[PDB]
Design a protein around this ligand. Structure first.
Ligand SMILES: CCCCCCCCCCCCCCCCCC(=O)OC[C@H](COP(=O)([O-])OC[C@H](O)COP(=O)([O-])OC[C@H](COC(=O)CCCCCCCCCCCCCCCCC)OC(=O)CCCCCCCCCCCCCCCCC)OC(=O)CCCCCCCCCCCCCCCCC
Lengths: 171, 63
């Protein structure tokens, strides 16, 4: 069959978010609140196109919007964020409940210096609507033509001509 | 019976039996063509109902 089309290695170069998972988990709710729109544009494009190769640029926007998220933490609130993700980082399951006072200090410093409200219980799991300018994929499965069905039954049912027609039976 | 009655009764019998014979030959040919091609209402062995397929957004996108 045909040749698969891989993008170049230059099309895969982006400035990586080189932080650990406890840094991401400590900043997760404010990341979902602030970096909402390009993340949801990317995931809409990702569930609609069903191809990562059709989703690179929006993905780069995700990797563009995460970094601007962290710099805006790193400029203003590096101390409560560091003290909070260290405590998140201690736990082997990375519990939020072990770290509520560092969470409260990080939320206080962020709400004072940046005005970000942490999302309540239920908010980040909502199904949201996304207004994009890319087109809807008309054939996302790349399906070819389907076979035509067999012709249906039509016409009023007349009796059997001369019955069963079984060898000598007249009905 | 009259020769008229037996004669025309015989012709009615011959019409009925010749029509039955032509229809039996057609029945053989129809069964042969439908088993060969599968495009008639007979020999329609089932395939999977596509009303069973889930069309919701799944947990992972590539599907
Ligand atoms: C106003 C509203 C009301 C109106 C009412 C109008 C009517 C008023 C009268 C009411 C009564 C009507 C009766 C029914 C209509 C006539 C049917 C008829 O005679 O068909 C002839 C039928 C076909 O001959 P036909 O000349 O081409 O057709 C004449 C009509 O057009 C026949 O018409 P058809 O072409 O439309 O017939 C359709 C088709 C015509 O037939 C065919 O297309 C051919 C296939 C027939 C079957 C062949 C099977 C062969 C292999 C098995 C053989 C078994 C062994 C034989 C018997 C052993 C002893 C029991 O019939 C069948 O296929 C059915 C099978 C035969 C059943 C006949 C009725 C039996 C009822 C009483 C049963 C009593 C026992 C009988 C003996 C058991 C065996 C039947 O003859 C035979 O098949 C030969 C055997 C005789 C059958 C039974 C005769 C009925 C009277 C029996 C009285 C004596 C009983 C003695 C005691 C018990 C036995 C020891």
């Amino acid at each position: 069959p045909g040749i698969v089309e891989l993008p170049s290695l230059e099309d895969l170069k982006v400035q990586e978010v080189k932080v650990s998972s406890s840094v991401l988990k400590a900043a997760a709710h404010h990341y979902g609140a602030q970096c909402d729109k390009p993340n949801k544009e990317f995931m809409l494009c990702r569930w609609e196109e069903k191809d990562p190769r059709r989703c690179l640029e929006e993905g780069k926007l995700v990797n563009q919007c995460a970094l601007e998220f962290f710099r805006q933490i790193k400029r203003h609130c590096a101390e409560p964020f560091t003290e909070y993700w260290t405590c998140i980082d201690y736990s082997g399951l990375q519990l939020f409940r072990r770290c509520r006072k560092e969470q409260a200090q990080f939320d206080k410093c962020v709400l004072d210096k940046l005005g970000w409200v942490r999302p309540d219980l239920g908010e980040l799991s909502k199904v949201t609507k996304v207004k994009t300018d890319r087109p809807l994929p008309e054939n996302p499965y790349h399906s070819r033509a389907r076979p035509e069905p067999n012709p249906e039954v039509e016409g009023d049912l007349k009796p059997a001509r001369h019955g069963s027609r079984l060898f000598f039976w007249t009905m | 019976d009259a020769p008229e009655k037996n004669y025309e009764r015989t012709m009615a019998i011959l019409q009925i039996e010749s029509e039955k014979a032509e229809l039996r030959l057609k029945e053989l040919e129809v069964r042969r063509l439908m088993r060969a091609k599968g495009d008639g209402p007979w020999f329609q062995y089932p395939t999977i109902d596509k009303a069973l397929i889930d069309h919701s957004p799944k947990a992972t996108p590539d599907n």
